[PDB]
Design a protein around this ligand. Structure first.
Ligand SMILES: Cc1cc2c(cc1C)N(C[C@H](O)[C@H](O)[C@H](O)COP(=O)(O)OP(=O)(O)OC[C@H]1O[C@@H](n3cnc4c(N)ncnc43)[C@H](O)[C@@H]1O)c1[nH]c(=O)[nH]c(=O)c1N2
Length: 453
DNA sequence: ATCGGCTCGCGCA
DNA sequence: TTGCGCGAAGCCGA
């Protein structure tokens, strides 16, 4: 294992108990550098490895759709793990308090957690270090090239990060070894409890039917692989040419699995690389899962204010500021945006895709966000509303790719200046008529019309 | 240091 | 649609 994937959080003396993988971002049994390191650390000490996961109360901020998708994954994973003789524990509370307690409770030898740039995981980690005395390690098991290794600074753009990343790919793109089973030796209640709490909040139809259609993405490590497999057989070949067409199902559809770590993106890269197809599609796809996925982790990790105005570049701050007092053609409230009551039937269509499938087509995510800027009273409100809806209804929400993506659309982060406009200033414009030239807009609106109810 | 090159709309064929 | 050349625009890093 490449030791540059390991960061030492808290130095100390190796206790003589088990090795504890605090699993958080990467909820998979396979292709998991964090669980592989733990087992290594375990194996030399002749102790077992165990996995702990903390079900916090953040689930009350989203909906049944994300929380059933996550728990059904953890149920499968639990089985996966016990078959490898690795027990799994599940705590319910504040990771700062519960993990600390647990580590003392079970006399853990060493502590290990996977990596995530989001503000709140570092808060927990800090709290955790004050509460323990054993060594504490962190492993990047989400990125092909560990976030802190790929760059030491905020990258202004893909085209600056891209040479830095591909120089290190030969070293970090590699196969995964086997999760060796242990040698030395309730989730269902939680899920029924959580839904009963979230139920008053369900996104319902007029006839009391749920909006959300749970059949588009089956959750779990197994299903995730079958999705990847299926993208490579049918859709990879056409990806470069039809990726940007909302009327063709030609995306990988991996982002819900990746978000929850139910499959490794290092694995996808390994499998796409070895696939023969259209070079242009492979190149198109690899740029998305390598450059754009991981510069997003770079963004949050070096900009703690990643979900606010002040993280924008100077030029875009200037510009939006200078157009704060422009007359907006339209001003909608969150509640109107939420229910698709704008004047723009293409915009409403894509919000109905969001509402019922929990995954809005990549290209329409750009449109969607910019019309929120154009049709709200201020850039901050735009940011607020676009974050709110993104995180509440996307299956892949509350994710670095989220904040980095919204910042692109509303703030030109990782983007450049365009012709000055009213209201949106120099931020990249997108039009209805421009979509008309690019895809059969009417089909798209047609598909999601019968939903206004 | 000096300037080439970065993930839209639109005219047009 | 489909692709090209052009525009408008701020800045990093050879
Ligand atoms: C307004 C808005 C909001 C969001 C986002 C963009 C925009 C404009 N993104 C990014 C992007 O829209 C999203 O990752 C894709 O829809 C994922 O779907 P597929 O895997 O089918 O993409 P596709 O199959 O084409 O790409 C495969 C993978 O490449 C990566 N990728 C693709 N587009 C990317 C992008 N624009 N930025 C970064 N990585 C990208 C992702 O890992 C994705 O799973 C995001 N992503 C996310 O998963 N959750 C979110 O909540 C958001 N938030």
């Amino acid at each position: 294992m490449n030791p540059k994937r390991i960061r030492a959080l808290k130095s100390g003396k190796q206790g003589d108990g088990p090795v504890v993988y605090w699993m958080s971002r990467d909820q998979r049994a396979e292709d998991n550098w964090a669980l592989l390191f733990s087992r290594a650390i375990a194996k030399e000490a002749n102790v077992p490895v165990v996995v702990v996961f903390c079900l916090t109360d953040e689930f009350l901020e989203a909906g049944i759709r994300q929380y059933e998708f996550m728990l059904k994954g953890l149920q499968e994973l639990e089985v996966s793990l016990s078959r490898k003789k690795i027990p799994s524990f599940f705590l319910r509370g504040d990771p700062g308090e519960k993990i600390s307690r647990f580590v003392k409770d079970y006399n853990a030898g060493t502590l290990v957690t996977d990596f995530s740039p989001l503000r709140i995981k570092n808060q927990w980690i800090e709290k955790v270090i004050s509460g323990i005395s054993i060594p504490f390690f962190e492993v990047d098991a989400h990125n092909v090239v560990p976030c802190w290794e790929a760059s030491q600074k905020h990258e202004y753009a893909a085209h600056t990060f891209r040479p830095k990343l591909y120089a290190l790919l030969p070293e970090f793109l590699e196969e995964f070894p086997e999760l060796e089973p242990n040698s030395v030796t309730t989730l269902s209640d939680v899920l029924e409890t959580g839904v009963k709490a979230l139920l008053p909040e369900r996104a319902l139809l007029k006839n009391k039917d749920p909006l959300f259609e749970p059949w588009h993405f089956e959750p779990g490590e197994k299903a995730a692989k079958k999705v990847m497999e299926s993208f490579i057989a049918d859709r990879l070949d056409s990806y470069g040419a039809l990726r940007n067409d909302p009327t063709k199902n030609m995306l990988s559809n991996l982002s819900p699995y990746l978000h929850f770590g139910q499959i490794s993106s290092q694995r996808v890269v390994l499998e796409v690389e070895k696939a023969e197809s259209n070079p242009g599609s492979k190149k198109a796809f690899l740029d998305e899962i390598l450059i754009w996925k991981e510069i997003s982790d770079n963004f949050c990790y070096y900009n703690p204010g990643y979900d606010g105005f002040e993280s924008f570049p100077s030029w875009a701050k200037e510009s939006l500021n200078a157009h704060r007092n422009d007359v907006r053609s339209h001003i909608y409230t969150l509640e109107e945006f939420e229910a698709g009551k704008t004047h723009d039937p293409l915009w409403n269509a894509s919000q109905m895709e969001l509402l019922s499938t929990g995954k809005m087509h990549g290209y329409m995510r750009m449109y969607w966000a910019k019309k929120i800027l154009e049709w709200s009273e201020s850039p901050e409100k735009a940011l607020e509303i676009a974050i709110c809806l993104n995180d509440r209804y996307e299956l892949d929400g509350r994710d670095p790719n989220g904040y980095a993506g919204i910042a692109w659309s509303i703030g030109g982060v990782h983007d450049r200046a365009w012709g000055e406009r009213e209201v949106t200033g120099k931020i990249r414009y997108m039009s209805y008529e421009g979509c008309k030239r690019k895809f059969d807009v009417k089909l798209y609106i047609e598909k999601y019309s019968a939903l206004d109810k």
